Curated annotation (Swiss-Prot), chain A:
<comment type="function">
    <text>Component of the 40S subunit of the ribosome. Part of the small subunit (SSU) processome, first precursor of the small eukaryotic ribosomal subunit. During the assembly of the SSU processome in the nucleolus, many ribosome biogenesis factors, an RNA chaperone and ribosomal proteins associate with the nascent pre-rRNA and work in concert to generate RNA folding, modifications, rearrangements and cleavage as well as targeted degradation of pre-ribosomal RNA by the RNA exosome.</text>
</comment>
<comment type="subunit">
    <text>Part of the 40S ribosomal subunit. Part of the small subunit (SSU) processome, composed of more than 70 proteins and the RNA chaperone small nucleolar RNA (snoRNA) U3.</text>
</comment>
<feature type="zinc finger region" description="C4-type">
    <location>
        <begin position="45"/>
        <end position="68"/>
    </location>
</feature>
<protein>
    <recommendedName>
        <fullName>Small ribosomal subunit protein eS31</fullName>
    </recommendedName>
</protein>
From Swiss-Prot, chain B:
<comment type="similarity">
    <text>Belongs to the universal ribosomal protein uS3 family.</text>
</comment>
<comment type="subunit">
    <text>Interacts with LTV1; the interaction is RNA-independent.</text>
</comment>
<comment type="function">
    <text>Has DNA repair activity directed towards the mutagenic lesions 8-oxoguanine and abasic sites in DNA. It can cleave DNA containing 8-oxoguanine residues efficiently. Also acts as an ap lyase, cleaving phosphodiester bonds via a beta,delta elimination reaction.</text>
</comment>
<protein>
    <recommendedName>
        <fullName>Small ribosomal subunit protein uS3</fullName>
    </recommendedName>
</protein>
From Swiss-Prot, chain C:
<dbReference type="InterPro" id="IPR020568">
    <property type="entry name" value="Ribosomal_Su5_D2-typ_SF"/>
</dbReference>
<keyword id="KW-0896">Oogenesis</keyword>
<dbReference type="GO" id="GO:0005737">
    <property type="term" value="C:cytoplasm"/>
</dbReference>
<keyword id="KW-0689">Ribosomal protein</keyword>
<feature type="modified residue" description="Phosphoserine">
    <location>
        <position position="23"/>
    </location>
</feature>
<dbReference type="Pfam" id="PF00333">
    <property type="entry name" value="Ribosomal_S5"/>
</dbReference>
<feature type="domain" description="S5 DRBM">
    <location>
        <begin position="48"/>
        <end position="111"/>
    </location>
</feature>
Length: 80, 57, 227
RNA sequence: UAGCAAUAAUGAGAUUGAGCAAUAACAGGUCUGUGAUGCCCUUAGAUGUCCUGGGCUGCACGCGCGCUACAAUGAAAGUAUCAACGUGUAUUUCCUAGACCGAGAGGUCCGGGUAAACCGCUGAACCACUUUCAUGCUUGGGAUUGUGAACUGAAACUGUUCACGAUGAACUUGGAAUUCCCAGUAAGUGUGAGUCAUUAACUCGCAUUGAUUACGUCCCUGCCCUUUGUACACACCGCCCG
RNA sequence: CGGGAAACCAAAGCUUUUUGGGCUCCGGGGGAAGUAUGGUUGCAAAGCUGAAACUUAAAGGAAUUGACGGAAGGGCACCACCAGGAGUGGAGCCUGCGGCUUAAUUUGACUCAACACGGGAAAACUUACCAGGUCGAACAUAAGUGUGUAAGACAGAUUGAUAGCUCUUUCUCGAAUCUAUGGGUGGUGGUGCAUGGCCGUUCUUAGUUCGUGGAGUGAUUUGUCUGGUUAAUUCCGAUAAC
């Protein structure tokens, strides 16, 4: 544990995990069609000024890129 | 501390100084701290010559 | 080993420096005081060994509250019959030692040693039985016959090897656990060795030469002239 | 050898207030002045670093330094008029001029001063004069308290401050006790500066008004000097007896 | 020319260098104790005799320095009085401290020498506190298939706030440091009784250290003074150094 000077153990008792990351099998099974047609797996940003080849999985359909770490969230029906 | 600091006392008296004192304070690992003053000379401590003559670091 | 030669501030220190006398006993013969310590290390000092005895602290009660003077006892001695004690208190233990050596080199007194019943071969221990007091501690000294190694406490054991005496029996009355007053009580005995009128000294004598008057108008000069 | 009655003489018996301040030390205070610091401690479960808010402002009470007053030498609205110490903006956020708009708080638009130059003759506050209140716990006093108007801070509540109307608490001079001071001093009255985005009753300065009463003794309480007693020497907060 | 530990004493000396005129009495650390007990004297009170058990590392003598008190002497001070004046202690509020209170009332300082202190006038910050709550720091400097060793930032949730703080959904981190640390760099964490530096009083003062000296067995000691002199260790002086 840990020791302060005057008041110890205010007790939420402090198990700290920022991100778990004993999970997250990486999406390297990249769909490449028959050579030389290709496919974009798990649709990234349509304008590819960013890299963003990050392959977020099938969520409930609100898909976020990862190089831009949560911006450019795209499937989609977006706004006007 | 009683000899090698005592050697540098008149290592500086060769220039012709009027007087030097060296105050070394602290513990000698008898952890109650002590201090002995290595007085030799005619030293002012007060007045305008205190700003003028004596120099300390 | 001067290394800087010092001026004689006294009178007969100049005569020592002038070479007017080469006899340390000539000073002892007329009993005039060796006043400056630079006299005897001209006459003596060729590896003439001394050793400290006793440097225990001595305090004084003040307002804030107790400050210490370290008092030293040093003992210097010629192994051909001269002795001295140093008694000097100081601030700290370095100048307690060195300050008393000058006092040890000024209290230097000859030692009379002699025979008991057999006038054979390098006079050995003591001519008679002597004692001396200072503050309740008396020490009689007994002339021990030849090869009878020193019978005394360690405080006059280290002191009487420095005195030119072969061996001794001694019998020290008093509180001799005060290791400084023990040493000073021996010296009043040894200084009496040239104060006991043996029948070896019943002739008249050549009366002396008066080193003032014999060397008088050779000091009518006003100069501190050496060799 | 000190006729110190020469007050005289004289701007001046020092302008006389201050800064520095030995020896000796204290178990004085500070490890939460610091990249002075031992060791200790805890840091992938942070005490750090802070992410946000609260608290240090919580209040039956004790105690401390203060502020404002307990008024008719005053109080109230005008009318006369003098400071000094100084501070003053540069990714600017300060001193401020002069117009404008505002009951005021405060708003617009421009100007000076990096300063003996501009605020600034720093033409401050009681004190001065005239009227209004007649010495009523009354307009003395402004505690308390409702609503509005504002300001800075992104953001303002047992509150961040500032005015406007309203409320008008105690207090009619403070028991036992206990402070500070001998002259431009006390005391009265302001202003600058400090921290300051905003908020001084605080302290560091400064000017102004300007008395009383000594002009000295050891009583009081301390501090020195010796002489003297001591069985005390973590020292009379001692030691210590049944 | 004595003697003694000294105080001191023509005896307390002649107790040389363990000495010697003769005679007599008494002591052998401190207590327990001049008690118990026996004997003896006494009208009694009590007197002359007089132990041990057990306990104890000191009791004691003469002197020295401080302590500097119904100890006398000589002096000094508005943090001391006399003579005065002004305020506090009364009330109101401001603020500090104690207490209680709460999760915290952070906390450091307690006669002067703590208590409008820490230049702490605290809205957050400060802040060390509290409650939620992030974020990586340096000798285990890393063995381990980067499918994660440490975050920037969607909606539902959550939170102080889509803060991806965290999580459902799940991409994304860049070993250019989680070493799974030696009980650690850091830390406003511990102890100022480990300390440095700083200061605070001590201490309104006048005091303090010498080198050599005529002065003690020695701690120590006219030197650093009885002046009948001064804010002052200040002096024409007694002078017993300069």
């Amino acid at each position: 544990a840990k020791k302060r000077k005057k008041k110890n153990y205010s007790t939420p008792k402090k198990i700290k995990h920022k991100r778990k990351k004993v999970k997250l099998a990486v999406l390297k099974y990249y769909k490449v069609d028959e050579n030389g047609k290709i496919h974009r797996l798990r649709r990234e940003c349509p304008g590819e000024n960013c890299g963003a080849g990050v392959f977020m999985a099938a969520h409930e359909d609100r898909h976020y890129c990862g190089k831009c770490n949560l911006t450019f969230v795209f499937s989609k029906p977006e706004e006007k | 501390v009683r000899r090698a600091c005592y050697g540098v006392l008149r290592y500086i008296m060769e220039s012709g100084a009027k007087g030097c004192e060296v105050v070394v304070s602290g513990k000698l690992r008898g952890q109650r701290a002590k201090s002995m003053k290595f007085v030799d000379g005619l030293m002012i401590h007060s007045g305008d010559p205190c700003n003028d003559y004596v120099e300390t670091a | 080993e001067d290394s800087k030669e010092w001026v004689p501030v006294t009178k007969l220190g100049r005569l020592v420096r002038e070479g007017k006398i080469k006899s340390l006993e000539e000073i002892y013969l007329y009993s005039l005081p060796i006043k400056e310590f630079e006299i005897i290390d001209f006459f003596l000092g060729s590896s003439l060994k001394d050793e400290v005895l006793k440097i225990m602290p001595v305090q004084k009660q003040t307002r804030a509250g107790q400050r210490t003077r370290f008092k030293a006892f040093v003992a210097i001695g010629d192994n051909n019959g001269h002795i001295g004690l140093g008694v000097k208190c100081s601030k700290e233990v370095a100048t307690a030692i060195r300050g008393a050596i000058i006092l040890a080199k000024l209290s230097v007194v000859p030692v009379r040693r002699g025979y008991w019943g057999n006038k054979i071969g390098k006079p050995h221990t003591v001519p008679c039985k002597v004692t001396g007091k200072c503050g309740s501690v008396s020490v009689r000294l007994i002339p021990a016959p030849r090869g009878t190694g020193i019978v005394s406490a360690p405080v006059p054991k280290k002191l009487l090897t420095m005195a030119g005496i072969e061996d001794c029996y001694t019998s020290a009355r008093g509180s001799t656990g005060t290791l400084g007053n023990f040493a000073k009580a021996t010296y009043a005995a040894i200084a009496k060795t040239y104060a006991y009128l043996t029948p070896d000294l019943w002739k008249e004598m050549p009366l002396g030469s008066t080193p003032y008057q014999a060397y008088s108008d050779f000091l009518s000069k006003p100069t501190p002239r050496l060799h």
